[PDB]
């Protein structure tokens, strides 16, 4: 068969996010949650440090 389009595991996207951190603004409250409380809302917390 011709095989027109190829398949992928996860989609990419055209518009992404950037950030400029200030390495002197740290809160002194190391918070915590569960593991499924972590995974779903996980990498999104580490883009908005």
């Amino acid at each position: 068969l011709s095989d027109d389009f190829k398949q992928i595991s996860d989609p990419k996207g055209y518009l992404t996010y950037s950030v400029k951190y200030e390495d002197q603004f740290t809160k002194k409250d190391k918070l915590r949650a569960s593991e499924a409380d972590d995974r779903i809302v996980g990498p999104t917390v580490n883009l908005f440090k």
């Binding site: 027109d4 389009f5 190829k6 398949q7 992928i8 595991s9 996860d10 989609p11 996207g13 055209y14 996010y17 949650a33 569960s34 593991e35 499924a36 409380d37 995974r39 779903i40 809302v41 996980g42 990498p43 999104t44 883009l47």
Partner: protein, 50 residues
């Protein structure tokens, strides 16, 4: 005005099909009542920023 005409070429000659892979399902006992009624049963494991 040549690069903006070139980014329009790549988006047009696209050809990709998304395939479900890696997905896992969490339990109700292991989620905050806030992060629960926002999830539709099964999330995609490799979740993106938002």
């Amino acid at each position: 005005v040549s690069g903006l005409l070139m980014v329009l070429f790549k988006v047009m000659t696209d050809n990709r099909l998304v395939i479900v892979g890696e997905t896992t399902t969490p339990m109700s006992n292991t989620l905050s009542t806030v992060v629960n009624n926002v999830l539709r049963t099964t999330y995609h494991n490799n979740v993106g920023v938002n």
